[PDB]
Amino acid sequence: LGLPILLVTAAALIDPDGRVLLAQRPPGLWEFPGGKLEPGETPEAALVRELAEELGVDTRASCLAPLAFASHSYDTFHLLMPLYACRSWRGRATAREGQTLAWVRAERLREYPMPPADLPLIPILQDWL
């Protein structure tokens, strides 16, 4: 059964040390920061404001380098989720939306329970890092 595509952006902020930023969903699993797209927005632009909204992070669409993507079918929509790698941003990441953050080293990634759709991105992130 044909379903609509839902585009969700994902950023992997990466430390000068190589730790990747992960965000846990507030009560009421870990995932990459990002979110749904909005009209007019390039995906790079939707990520740039979600990074500011969610983390207080300030970066340029040009600092966002395409890395990989997740593609997964749910019941009412198929998820397509491009993951961007970001090594340069201004300000330090703070949980503005009541979430808990975590900078985790490539190897400890599998210690973080993620939504099943995000799982395939982990091996890819590791090989990259």
Added chain:
Amino acid sequence: PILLVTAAALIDPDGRVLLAQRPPGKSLAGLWEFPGGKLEPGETPEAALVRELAEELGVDTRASCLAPLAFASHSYDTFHLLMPLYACRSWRGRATAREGQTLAWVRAERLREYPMPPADLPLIPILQDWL
């Protein structure tokens, strides 16, 4: 507005990857590109690629043979291209140009010899590593 396109990287047993040259005289006429195309209503990007590989090359594969490899995201003048790329090592039938296009099985190091749209260009290193 966003335009979604799905590209496949067919790899044969000997490491070569298939490129298809756009014909005259459509957008980006003589440039080489990874086979694929627009998605139709209700299609998963995988399903679109399955249909596309069949129409374009008479190549028959399944969704589960498609490995998320990377994506291109380029700003063009009228639309913004978001283009997921999948690796594919397993398909039935020999790849044959059905839509006019000219084909090339290129060894990874020679990927540079083939001019592509500027949007596909970042995909090459990501492909070279993967291989």
